[PDB]
Scaffold this active site. Structure first.
Site, PDB file in Angstrom:
ATOM      1  N   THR A 152      -4.244  10.141   1.392  1.00  0.00           N
ATOM      2  CA  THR A 152      -3.232   9.083   1.185  1.00  0.00           C
ATOM      3  C   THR A 152      -2.727   8.373   2.428  1.00  0.00           C
ATOM      4  O   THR A 152      -2.727   7.051   1.950  1.00  0.00           O
ATOM      5  CB  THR A 152      -1.812  10.025   0.644  1.00  0.00           C
ATOM      6  OG1 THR A 152      -2.142  10.387  -0.397  1.00  0.00           O
ATOM      7  CG2 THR A 152      -0.950   8.802   0.027  1.00  0.00           C
ATOM      8  N   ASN A 173      -3.987  12.431   7.091  1.00  0.00           N
ATOM      9  CA  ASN A 173      -2.745  12.956   7.144  1.00  0.00           C
ATOM     10  C   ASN A 173      -2.034  13.726   8.083  1.00  0.00           C
ATOM     11  O   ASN A 173      -0.944  13.979   8.228  1.00  0.00           O
ATOM     12  CB  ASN A 173      -2.648  13.800   5.569  1.00  0.00           C
ATOM     13  CG  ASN A 173      -2.869  12.932   4.482  1.00  0.00           C
ATOM     14  OD1 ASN A 173      -2.911  11.771   4.278  1.00  0.00           O
ATOM     15  ND2 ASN A 173      -2.766  13.565   3.432  1.00  0.00           N
ATOM     16  N   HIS A 258      -3.410  17.956  -8.480  1.00  0.00           N
ATOM     17  CA  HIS A 258      -3.716  19.228  -7.617  1.00  0.00           C
ATOM     18  C   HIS A 258      -3.511  20.491  -8.287  1.00  0.00           C
ATOM     19  O   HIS A 258      -4.152  21.334  -7.835  1.00  0.00           O
ATOM     20  CB  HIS A 258      -2.823  19.032  -6.161  1.00  0.00           C
ATOM     21  CG  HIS A 258      -3.053  18.195  -5.249  1.00  0.00           C
ATOM     22  ND1 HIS A 258      -4.301  18.347  -4.347  1.00  0.00           N
ATOM     23  CD2 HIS A 258      -2.467  17.022  -4.882  1.00  0.00           C
ATOM     24  CE1 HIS A 258      -4.252  17.306  -3.451  1.00  0.00           C
ATOM     25  NE2 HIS A 258      -3.303  16.432  -3.765  1.00  0.00           N
ATOM     26  N   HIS A 407      -9.028  16.110  -2.510  1.00  0.00           N
ATOM     27  CA  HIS A 407      -9.628  14.926  -2.283  1.00  0.00           C
ATOM     28  C   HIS A 407      -9.715  14.968  -0.857  1.00  0.00           C
ATOM     29  O   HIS A 407      -9.009  15.766  -0.169  1.00  0.00           O
ATOM     30  CB  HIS A 407      -8.805  13.849  -2.906  1.00  0.00           C
ATOM     31  CG  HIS A 407      -7.464  13.441  -2.436  1.00  0.00           C
ATOM     32  ND1 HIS A 407      -7.006  13.191  -1.372  1.00  0.00           N
ATOM     33  CD2 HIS A 407      -6.357  14.301  -3.283  1.00  0.00           C
ATOM     34  CE1 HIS A 407      -5.991  13.015  -1.168  1.00  0.00           C
ATOM     35  NE2 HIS A 407      -5.377  13.782  -2.073  1.00  0.00           N
TER      36      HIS A 407
HETATM   37  C1  LIG Z   1       2.564   8.512   1.307  1.00  0.00           C
HETATM   38  C2  LIG Z   1       3.655   8.088   1.138  1.00  0.00           C
HETATM   39  C3  LIG Z   1       4.382   7.464   2.390  1.00  0.00           C
HETATM   40  N1  LIG Z   1       5.213   8.201   2.854  1.00  0.00           N
HETATM   41  C4  LIG Z   1       5.715   7.337   4.081  1.00  0.00           C
HETATM   42  C5  LIG Z   1       6.694   7.715   4.883  1.00  0.00           C
HETATM   43  C6  LIG Z   1       7.501   8.884   4.828  1.00  0.00           C
HETATM   44  C7  LIG Z   1       6.906   6.980   6.098  1.00  0.00           C
HETATM   45  C8  LIG Z   1       6.047   5.789   6.206  1.00  0.00           C
HETATM   46  N2  LIG Z   1       6.141   4.961   7.243  1.00  0.00           N
HETATM   47  C9  LIG Z   1       7.344   5.309   8.022  1.00  0.00           C
HETATM   48  C10 LIG Z   1       6.990   4.493   9.701  1.00  0.00           C
HETATM   49  N3  LIG Z   1       6.813   3.149   9.319  1.00  0.00           N
HETATM   50  C11 LIG Z   1       6.728   2.375  10.384  1.00  0.00           C
HETATM   51  C12 LIG Z   1       6.655   0.736  10.385  1.00  0.00           C
HETATM   52  O1  LIG Z   1       7.636   0.371   9.462  1.00  0.00           O
HETATM   53  N4  LIG Z   1       5.714   0.269  10.763  1.00  0.00           N
HETATM   54  C13 LIG Z   1       4.477   0.418  11.483  1.00  0.00           C
HETATM   55  C14 LIG Z   1       4.149  -0.761  11.543  1.00  0.00           C
HETATM   56  O2  LIG Z   1       4.052  -1.435  13.042  1.00  0.00           O
HETATM   57  C15 LIG Z   1       5.475  -1.248  10.792  1.00  0.00           C
HETATM   58  C16 LIG Z   1       5.453   3.095   8.740  1.00  0.00           C
HETATM   59  C17 LIG Z   1       5.270   3.782   7.215  1.00  0.00           C
HETATM   60  C18 LIG Z   1       5.015   5.380   5.051  1.00  0.00           C
HETATM   61  N5  LIG Z   1       4.955   6.277   4.109  1.00  0.00           N
HETATM   62  C19 LIG Z   1       4.244   6.329   2.960  1.00  0.00           C
HETATM   63  N6  LIG Z   1       3.289   5.386   2.879  1.00  0.00           N
HETATM   64  C20 LIG Z   1       2.122   5.440   3.430  1.00  0.00           C
HETATM   65  C21 LIG Z   1       3.569   4.417   1.941  1.00  0.00           C
HETATM   66  N7  LIG Z   1       2.606   3.276   1.724  1.00  0.00           N
HETATM   67  C22 LIG Z   1       3.327   2.472   0.797  1.00  0.00           C
HETATM   68  C23 LIG Z   1       2.261   1.419   0.463  1.00  0.00           C
HETATM   69  C24 LIG Z   1       1.582   0.796   1.514  1.00  0.00           C
HETATM   70  C25 LIG Z   1       0.879  -0.397   1.203  1.00  0.00           C
HETATM   71  C26 LIG Z   1       1.034  -0.942  -0.276  1.00  0.00           C
HETATM   72  F1  LIG Z   1       0.022  -1.722  -0.390  1.00  0.00           F
HETATM   73  C27 LIG Z   1       1.660  -0.077  -1.244  1.00  0.00           C
HETATM   74  C28 LIG Z   1       2.492   1.121  -0.805  1.00  0.00           C
HETATM   75  C29 LIG Z   1       4.486   2.770   0.476  1.00  0.00           C
HETATM   76  C30 LIG Z   1       5.088   2.039  -0.835  1.00  0.00           C
HETATM   77  N8  LIG Z   1       5.783   1.521  -1.312  1.00  0.00           N
HETATM   78  S1  LIG Z   1       4.993   4.125   0.970  1.00  0.00           S
HETATM   79 ZN   LIG Z   2      -2.797  10.145  -2.158  1.00  0.00          ZN
HETATM   80 ZN   LIG Z   3      -3.337  14.609  -2.863  1.00  0.00          ZN
END
Ligand SMILES: CCc1nc2c(C)cc(N3CCN(CC(=O)N4CC(O)C4)CC3)cn2c1N(C)c1nc(-c2ccc(F)cc2)c(C#N)s1
Ligand SMILES: [Zn+2]
Ligand SMILES: [Zn+2]
Ligand SMILES: *[C@@H]1O[C@H](CO)[C@@H](O[C@@H]2O[C@H](CO)[C@@H](O[C@@H]3O[C@H](CO[C@H]4O[C@H](CO[C@H]5O[C@H](CO)[C@@H](O)[C@H](O)[C@@H]5O)[C@@H](O)[C@H](O[C@H]5O[C@H](CO)[C@@H](O)[C@H](O)[C@@H]5O[C@H]5O[C@H](CO)[C@@H](O)[C@H](O)[C@@H]5O)[C@@H]4O)[C@@H](O)[C@H](O)[C@@H]3O)[C@H](O)[C@H]2NC(C)=O)[C@H](O)[C@H]1NC(C)=O
Ligand SMILES: *[C@@H]1O[C@H](CO)[C@@H](O)[C@H](O)[C@H]1NC(C)=O
Ligand SMILES: [Ca+2]
Ligand SMILES: [Cl-]
Ligand SMILES: [Cl-]
Ligand SMILES: [Cl-]
Ligand SMILES: [Mg+2]
Length: 768
Positions: A152, A173, A258, A407
């Site tokens: 993810t 991860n 899962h 996965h």
């Molecule tokens: C697996 C779900 C998830 N959980 C988190 C958590 C807990 C924190 C997180 N962060 C927290 C820290 N954050 C730091 C930040 O703002 N930046 C790093 C760059 O310089 C900008 C980066 C992302 C992402 N998360 C994510 N991610 C990776 C997410 N991705 C997405 C996402 C990203 C791209 C897309 F096109 C769509 C959705 C989200 C939405 N909506 S949430």
């Molecule tokens: Zn995933």
């Molecule tokens: Zn998974």
């Protein structure tokens, strides 16, 4: 500290704190839970609630004033004003953006779904009627290829940045950074620290160029229905505060996948539930009359595969001391020493002990630089030297079921493939497009918002065929070739050796995109770009027709090597170096076996066609050249073959300069390739032969690792027909991968548009 007595009134999920990260490891206002997370009476209106007295305790509202305030339930005017759901309407084409006056551009909503396997779209309008209408009415592909590892965090951030995990830093991860001496985990405060996250994600790229972004992270406390309403509320804001890019994330269908596995009967209801959330978004957009204004991307991060605890390999069955190593386990393996300054720890011994111990071993060890180059999974200090590719359906663990699905496997595995749908004024109408890699969407999403993308690993222009309405430019040739005639006598050489374009160069000469010196050498059967710096060809182009004959080399001409009179002795290889090197031999880029006559066969023994090759690799190369090229030509109605060497000693996926090369032929300046490539091209219309092609092209390519043994191939003791094809397929490649690795630019003179050529260069023949 923050004064939590301050309120969140009229600023829930603002862009004391009331943002989406305030529950993570911060603190919200005292009335955040009361004002922002209201759940009273559900997320749907009834006939009972129509025109009701407004109660602020409700989650959403059905009162007459709710539309002007922009906090109606998504089905309000369906229930109360006799309108139809978005799904029940006929599919009408959007020939232009129908946005309210004041909008500077169409908005983009990125609807991401965790673990949405591509084959789930086969369920159809019974289970997922909203998604199916989005898919059939908009632009779609059979699948979208994720990046490796198919997890993810690596994939969602790849989507955000257009970068391979090696380049953006989120390589798993779970991961350990030895400079930080810290561990990233799914659970914990560490993952929120900015130092882990490299590159420039879409939301920063947007903000820097004057485009307001919604949150790209929702807290797990906020329910899915609230997230949609929040996005709809933000869309009703005034022009100065209203974002132009939005994101939604769901943890389904991953969480269920899962527990029950991808094909379980319990998967049906989670898919129904996701489609219910998609329907709320489209109905709510219709209420705002933005349903023919917003561009919507329905995208997944990866697929899902049947995996159970029964199918676990244990490292303790192969190694003696598993208490001295740390293993990042599961659908991949990463091994390092548990304790530093441990003299007992030996990487070579660990790899040897994990290599081909059973006939049906369900993983394979690799040093990271020996991984298939298509994975782009080496150039980061967070990726451990020792890597295990796990066979699909299996796990690896250190030593000895709740789950039925997982996965993370190799990203060309069918079950890891995921989904893409693009719907809106800027996407095409009822159009099907070829599969593509998720690294390409960053550029598309930038195009859709009018943004200049940051440097990324997509190929800008390769997905133009997704949009109704960026013009890509071909790179400038840096070094022009020399065309030497006859300039040296046979007696000038003391190498210790004893003894066209219309047919063989179909798509133009490759452009060298770095500062060097090279010669074009013409022959009857082949053409080449000979490097006077690297002392061998950069490329070799030749065409085998459908009915071409394989002859053999006579016994007396086996060790024939001839000087080439067009190239100086001091810019040529010599046989003496190869005689002295006990480990190294040589091979040819154009094979003597495919010579058009005995007279022409002498051209194939020129020292300018020679390349350095370990004996173990010659078993692979001879089989490719003697057997497989004829077989591909027969099956594809002839083929054009471009072959050459690759030097990538620092495993960064990019062409090496001279100083990066660490291995030469004994007592010489002849550099040893790390890999050998071939680009095999024919007509997509296979009824036309390859040299007389009118329409679109068909291409397959490989980047074979140049290794002194065949320890990767467990059946290598057998005949080459039992193992060589299997090796090559594992190392299949995009033409673009070869371009990065060589600094060459191919397909510069065809009858196709340059956009269509960039699609061809990004294609991966997966063999699945
Ligand atoms: C697996 C779900 C998830 N959980 C988190 C958590 C807990 C924190 C997180 N962060 C927290 C820290 N954050 C730091 C930040 O703002 N930046 C790093 C760059 O310089 C900008 C980066 C992302 C992402 N998360 C994510 N991610 C990776 C997410 N991705 C997405 C996402 C990203 C791209 C897309 F096109 C769509 C959705 C989200 C939405 N909506 S949430
Ligand atoms: Zn995933
Ligand atoms: Zn998974
Ligand atoms: C896939 O595409 C990638 C992007 O085009 C290619 O990666 C790039 O490769 C080139 C050539 O090797 C590198 O160019 C050298 O850059 C050196 C300076 O780099 C440092 O500064 C950069 C600052 O960038 C600014 O702008 C960006 C957005 O564009 C912002 O995000 C920044 O904050 C900043 O405002 C920066 O990009 C770069 O980032 C790396 O390092 C940090 C931590 O130090 C990591 O968090 C981050 O993940 C990057 O790490 C990656 O690259 C480094 C090497 O730079 C690797 O060691 C590491 O393993 C990882 O792969 C850094 O801070 C400069 O001194 C030189 O003269 C060159 O100009 C780019 O640095 C590199 N960029 C990125 C983002 O990877 C990649 O080759 C390509 N791959 C293939 C196979 O085609
Ligand atoms: C490799 O296997 C042998 C034979 O079982 C064993 O004695 C040896 O200790 C193993 N080496 C490592 C590094 O695990
Ligand atoms: Ca390199
Ligand atoms: Cl507009
Ligand atoms: Cl042909
Ligand atoms: Cl084409
Ligand atoms: Mg030798």
């Amino acid at each position: 500290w923050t004064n939590i007595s301050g309120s969140c009134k009229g600023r829930c999920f603002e862009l004391c704190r009331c943002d989406n990260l305030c529950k993570s490891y911060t603190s919200c206002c005292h009335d955040f839970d009361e004002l922002c997370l209201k759940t009273a009476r559900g997320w749907e209106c009834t006939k009972d609630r129509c025109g009701e007295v407004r109660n602020e305790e409700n989650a959403c509202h059905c009162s007459e004033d709710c539309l002007a305030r922009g906090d109606c339930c998504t089905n309000y005017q369906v229930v109360c004003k006799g309108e139809s759901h978005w799904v029940d309407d006929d599919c009408e084409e959007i020939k232009a953006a129908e946005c309210p006056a004041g909008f500077v551009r169409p908005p983009l909503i990125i609807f991401s779904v965790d673990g949405f396997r591509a084959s789930y779209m086969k369920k159809g309008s019974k289970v997922m009627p909203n998604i199916e209408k989005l898919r059939s009415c908009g632009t779609h592909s059979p699948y979208m290829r994720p990046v490796y590892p198919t997890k993810t965090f690596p994939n969602l951030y790849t989507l955000a940045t257009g970068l391979y995990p090696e380049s953006h830093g989120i390589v798993g991860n779970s991961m350990y950074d030895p400079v930080f001496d810290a561990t990233f985990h799914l659970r914990g405060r560490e993952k929120f620290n900015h130092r882990w996250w490299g590159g420039q994600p879409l939301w920063i790229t947007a903000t820097k160029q004057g485009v307001k972004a919604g949150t790209f992270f929702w807290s797990v406390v906020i329910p899915h229905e609230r997230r949609i309403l929040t996005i709809l509320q933000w869309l009703t804001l005034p022009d100065h505060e209203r974002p132009s890019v939005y994101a939604f994330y769901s943890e389904q269908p991953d969480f269920s996948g899962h527990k029950y596995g991808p094909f379980g009967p319990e998967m049906t209801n989670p898919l129904r539930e996701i489609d219910k959330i998609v329907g709320q978004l489209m109905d709510g957009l219709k209420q705002l009359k933005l349903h023919r204004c917003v561009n919507v991307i329905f995208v997944g991060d990866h697929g899902m595969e049947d995996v159970t605890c029964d199918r676990t390999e244990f490292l303790s069955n192969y190694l003696t001391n598993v208490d001295d190593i740390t293993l990042v386990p599961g659908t991949l393996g990463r091994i390092r020493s548990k304790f530093s300054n441990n003299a007992k720890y030996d990487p070579k011994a660990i790899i040897a002990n994990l290599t081909c111990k059973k006939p049906d071993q369900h993983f394979k060890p690799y040093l990271k630089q020996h991984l298939p180059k298509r994975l782009h999974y080496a150039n980061n200090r967070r990726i451990e030297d020792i890597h295990l590719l796990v066979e699909r359906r299996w796990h690896v663990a250190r030593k000895p079921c709740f789950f039925q699905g997982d996965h993370g496997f190799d990203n060309k595995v069918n079950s890891m493939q995921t989904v893409f749908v693009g719907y809106g004024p800027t996407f095409k109408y009822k159009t099907k497009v070829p599969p593509f890699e998720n690294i390409e969407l960053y550029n598309v999403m930038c195009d859709l918002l009018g943004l200049k993308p940051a440097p990324n690993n997509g190929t800008h222009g390769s997905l133009n065929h997704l949009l109704r309405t960026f013009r890509p430019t071909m790179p400038e040739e840096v070094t022009r070739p020399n065309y030497p005639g006859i300039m040296y006598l046979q007696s000038d050489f003391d190498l210790g050796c004893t003894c066209t374009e219309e047919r063989h160069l179909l798509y133009g000469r490759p452009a060298v995109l770095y500062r060097t010196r090279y010669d074009i050498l013409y022959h009857t059967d082949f053409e080449s770009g000979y490097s006077e710096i690297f002392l061998m060809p950069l490329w070799t182009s030749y065409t085998v027709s459908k009915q071409a004959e394989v002859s053999s080399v006579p016994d007396h001409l086996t060790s024939c090597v001839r000087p080439d009179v067009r190239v100086s002795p001091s810019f040529s290889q010599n046989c003496l170096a190869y005689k002295n090197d006990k480990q190294m031999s040589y091979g040819f880029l154009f094979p003597p076996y495919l010579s058009s006559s005995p007279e022409a066969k002498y051209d194939a023994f020129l020292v300018t066609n020679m390349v350095p090759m370990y004996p173990a690799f010659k078993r692979v190369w001879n089989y490719f050249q003697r057997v497989l090229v004829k077989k591909y030509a027969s099956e594809r109605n002839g083929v054009n073959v471009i072959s050459g060497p690759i030097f990538d000693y620092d495993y960064d996926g990019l062409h090496d300069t001279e100083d990066k090369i660490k291995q030469y032929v004994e007592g010489s300046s002849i550099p040893v390739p790390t890999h050998y490539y071939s680009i095999i091209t024919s007509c997509l219309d296979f009824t036309q032969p390859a040299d007389k092609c009118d329409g679109p092209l068909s291409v397959s390519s490989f980047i074979l690792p140049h290794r002194p043994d065949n320890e990767e191939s467990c059946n290598s003791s057998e005949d080459e027909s039992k193992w060589v094809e299997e090796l090559m397929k594992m190392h299949t490649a995009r033409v673009r991968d070869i371009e990065h690795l060589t600094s060459l630019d191919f397909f510069r003179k065809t009858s196709r548009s340059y956009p269509e050529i960039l699609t061809l260069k990004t294609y991966l023949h997966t063999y699945e």
